[PDB]
Every structure is written in C-alpha cells, then in structure tokens.
Design an enzyme around this catalytic site. Structure first.
Site, PDB file in Angstrom:
ATOM      1  CD  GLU A  75      -2.866  -0.945   2.438  1.00  0.00           C
ATOM      2  OE1 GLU A  75      -2.725   0.053   3.179  1.00  0.00           O
ATOM      3  OE2 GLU A  75      -3.718  -1.834   2.637  1.00  0.00           O
ATOM      4  CG  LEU A 183      -3.942   2.625   0.572  1.00  0.00           C
ATOM      5  CD1 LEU A 183      -3.611   1.795  -0.668  1.00  0.00           C
ATOM      6  CD2 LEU A 183      -2.845   3.650   0.843  1.00  0.00           C
ATOM      7  CB  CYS A 184      -5.944   0.222   3.641  1.00  0.00           C
ATOM      8  SG  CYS A 184      -6.231  -1.464   4.189  1.00  0.00           S
ATOM      9  CG  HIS A 185      -6.908  -0.208   8.573  1.00  0.00           C
ATOM     10  ND1 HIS A 185      -6.635  -1.383   7.909  1.00  0.00           N
ATOM     11  CD2 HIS A 185      -8.001  -0.452   9.334  1.00  0.00           C
ATOM     12  CE1 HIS A 185      -7.527  -2.297   8.251  1.00  0.00           C
ATOM     13  NE2 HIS A 185      -8.367  -1.757   9.115  1.00  0.00           N
ATOM     14  N   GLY A 258      -7.922   4.863  -1.464  1.00  0.00           N
ATOM     15  CA  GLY A 258      -7.961   3.501  -1.966  1.00  0.00           C
ATOM     16  C   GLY A 258      -8.714   2.697  -0.923  1.00  0.00           C
TER      17      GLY A 258
END
Ligand SMILES: [Ca+2]
Ligand SMILES: [Ca+2]
Lengths: 281, 281
Positions: A75, A183-185, A258
């Site tokens: 990531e 993105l993500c967390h 993301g």
C-alpha cells in the site's frame, strides 16, 4: 496446531504476525504494479509529497495480545512507485521521529521493482523526519509539498488518529488546497482533526470495519480491534463508499483514497494522474 | 551457541539481536535479585516513582544496521522489584506513548520473582502513559512522585537524550529535590538538559564508552554506536566514576546510579534504602 494460528513475533512478548494461512491468502511474492510509465513526467525537481508513516509495530488487541503490524509495504510502495516515475520526490516522517515500521510479512520479496523502490528510500524510512520539525519549517503558503500521503496497514491506527500534529498537517493541506492521499486503514489518521468538521461531506473509500471483524477468524490478527475507525470517520462527516473491497479508488476534489491492500496500484495511477495535471499549466 | 554472528530479527529488515555467543555471556536464565526485604515498607499510599522507558527497539548503528535493543529487563525490573517491596508504586511512560520496548533476549526466563513483577506491571509497560501528559498534570510543586527512574539498555539512547520533555522532568526533579535513579546507558537521558549546567559537579557511574566500543567484536551489537554518551555526560559536568563494571552503585545527594547490567540489584537496595529513609522523616 493450525496454519490459522497467529505467528509468534520473537522480538516482542505476546505479539503475533499473521497466521501462515492468512499470509498465503492475503500476501504474495509479487505485487500487481502496472502502468507505472509516464511519458511526460514532472521534471521541475521542486514538488514533493510528504509521507506520514507508522512509527509503531505493536497494536493492542481486545484480548491483550499485540498484533505485529505497521504500514502495509504494498500500500505504501505502489503509490510511491507511480509518483516516483511521475517525477515527484518524498520526505518521510513519523510522529516520534522513530523508524517507520513495515509489515515485512507482506513485502513482495520477489518483486524487483517494489524492492528497488524501498531500497531507494530505505535511509529515509529507517531515519525519517519527525513530524514536528516538518510542521515548523516545511509547510505554510510556500511549501514544496504538493500533497500528503498516509499509507495504510493497521499501524496507521496508532498515534496518527489523535495526533495534534497530524491535525495541523491535514488543516494545512485543506487550507492550501493540497492533495491528501491515503488508503485502507490510512484514513484513520483523518480522525486527528477531532471535532473540526473540515471533512464534512467528503466521500472516501476505506477498509471496511466489517472485514476487520472477520480476518481474525483465519489468524490474520491475534485478536480483534478495540475500536472501529470506519464508524469514527462517519461520525466526523465522512461518507464511506465501499461496502467491500476490490481495489477501488475515489477522488473527491483533492482527497484521493484507496479501499484496501488491493488498491495500491490504482491509487498510484490516480495520484500520478492528478498531480501531473496539477503541475501542468 | 558459540556463534558470534548477530542474530537477524524477523520483525525488521537489516535488524539484529545480539549474537548467540554474546547472549550466553551477557544474559542468564536467572537474575541475581536478592535482599529485597523491607520489614517496614512505606504504606502512605502517596509517593510513587515515574519510570521513563524506551519506546524504540531499533537503534541505527554506524554501518546502517539496526541493533534490536530497547530497555534492559533486568536493569529495569530489579530496581522496581526492591522499590515495590519497599512499598512504592510506579507510573510508566514513554515519549510517544507507544509501548516500552524490552530487550526480551535478556529476560531471565526462569526467574519466577522477576517474571512475577513483570506480570504485575505488564499492562503499564505495554500501554504506558505519554510523558507529555505527565509533565502537564502530574509534576509541579505538589507532585506525588518521590523520584524518577530511567532504566538502561541501549534503547535509552533514543529520543530521551535530546527530549525537551525529559529536560522538563529532570529540571523538575532537581528543583523539587526529587530522586533521580538510573544505570548503565540510562544516564544518557540526563543529556536532555542540553546546556543547562544543572548536573555540574555530580558524580555517577555509567556504562563505559570503551566497553561499548568492544562488545560488537563478539556480535553483541551488529555495529558500533554513532556517538558516545559517556563523553557527552562528562561534557556537561558529570564526573564518571567507573572505568570498568562490577555492578556497583553510587549516591551523590539524590542522584542514584548503577554502572551496568550487573548493577540492577544493588541499585534496588540503594534506592529502596534512600527512599525509605526519606519517607521516614
Ligand atoms: Ca492489511
Ligand atoms: Ca546492555
């Protein structure tokens, strides 16, 4: 016993890397990096992206165990790889000034490109800037930063979410109309703004809280998270668009996000595209 | 077993634990904890001791490698053990608020008493206070802290030596005539006062720089330290008393120091006796 049992991390007592089974399912020896060639890259050598990484690897689970986590390497490196090829440079910072901690268990060991990029920036990841120094000198109206990148991985859940320094960086970015990439967390960091409603009405994609509640079942984590960053984000005005994950990316003005460890490449392309258009006139 | 090659730390790339050989020579399955018996302990329930621990495990060596270090568990726990029996409680804090990092490879796995004390304080070592909060609401003229304890281990060499927060704590301790307890590499934290001639004329014992210069020869560390805390300490007024190490301690007014990983027990006795005599007056 099972390949689903969390893997003990030798460096920290009661800490665990993801289970062998979850690693085989959620990580791979190669990334899906693609379309990272930019025929007319930025060549001005001025614009940089500030990277705010995780300085802690051990996250406390609801059952007292530590999840040996940190920033997700894919990531983090895919978006950076695209931006690098687009002609942009990076400054890497952590809250404490301590080393950025990566989930090395997710590093695609057979990916030449990704490993080459890490090596390029390894001295910065290992000896990053302390965010307070950046705030005090490299921001403002004349900053050389065109945007800020907050990689994912569960390591982004520590410190960043309620750091007054991160709050300052986010307010700066919004005030100066700079790109915010995550993105993500990673978006958990946005919670650093506290009760400030500057993100009211913004749409983003982020790792579903629902999935965080399920991954422990196969030993990806040694326990469950003690809070839900998603519900928290919704509480400060954010609209989470994705119910699931599929590598989806979204752009709301200058907020580029993301949805999961599957969105690294797409986010890199989106950021590179967006920043390149911004620098051209 | 006799292998002198630094041992790779799986959680971090280019990071190393001490070699198997150095571990057999510098660590043991049991500590030499003894004489932790105080028939009339402090039972006032007020006086506590503030522990400033290391929040980082990876120390950059002069050759680019990371020494997988942190606070030395024996140096940390034996003093606390005696003080605990003397009737004092502890508050544990780090600069970042991130968990205290121990050199688990030095933890005496067969020492029931030492492991029992860690169990009592594990939740505090794992989820410590953030020193900034401590400085804001727990110090001052009416503090409940009777002293500060800065354990050794090379992890004490990171952040603490130039922390404005540690400076505030030290200035407070000296102004309010509080005990300052440290050993081995812990005194490196005293450098946080920067150019304040506060410790001018004080005598202390600390881990010899010249010994630091030699332990890597057997793989204790994957490289050499980028600076020498001993010389820097002398540069700000301290008179380093010891040339070698024997586990001895020294008290100069309310400054209590131990000379190395061998001084844990003696420092506990010295500290317990001084604090008990203090509260008994
Ligand atoms: Ca993940
Ligand atoms: Ca040592």
């Amino acid at each position: 016993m099972n390949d689903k049992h969390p893997t003990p991390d030798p460096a920290e007592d009661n800490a665990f890397f993801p289970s062998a089974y979850s690693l085989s399912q959620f990580t791979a020896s190669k990334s899906d990096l693609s379309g990272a060639h930019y025929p007319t890259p930025y060549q001005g050598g001025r614009w940089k992206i500030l990277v705010v990484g995780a300085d802690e690897r051990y996250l406390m689970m609801d059952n007292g165990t530590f999840f040996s986590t940190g920033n997700h390497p894919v990531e983090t490196l895919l978006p950076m790889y695209h931006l690098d090829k687009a002609g942009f440079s990076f400054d890497i910072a952590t809250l404490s000034g301590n080393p950025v901690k990566f989930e090395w268990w997710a590093m695609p060991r057979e990916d030449q490109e990704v490993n080459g990029l890490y090596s390029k920036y390894q001295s910065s990841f290992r000896q990053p800037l302390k965010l307070s120094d950046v705030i005090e000198t490299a921001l403002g109206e004349d900053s050389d930063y065109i945007g800020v990148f907050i990689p994912g991985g569960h390591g982004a859940l520590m410190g960043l979410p309620d750091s007054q320094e991160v709050k300052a960086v986010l307010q700066w970015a919004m005030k100066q109309n700079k790109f915010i990439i995550s993105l993500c967390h990673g978006p958990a960091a946005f919670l650093a703004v506290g009760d400030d409603p500057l993100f009211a009405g913004y749409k983003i994609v982020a790792f579903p809280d629902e999935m965080d509640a399920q991954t422990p079942s196969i030993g990806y984590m040694p326990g469950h998270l003690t809070w839900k960053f998603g519900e928290q984000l919704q509480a400060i005005g954010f609209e989470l668009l994705n119910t699931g994950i599929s590598g989806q990316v979204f752009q709301d003005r200058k907020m580029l996000t993301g949805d999961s460890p599957l969105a690294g490449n797409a986010l890199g392309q989106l950021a590179a595209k967006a920043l390149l258009a911004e620098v051209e006139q």
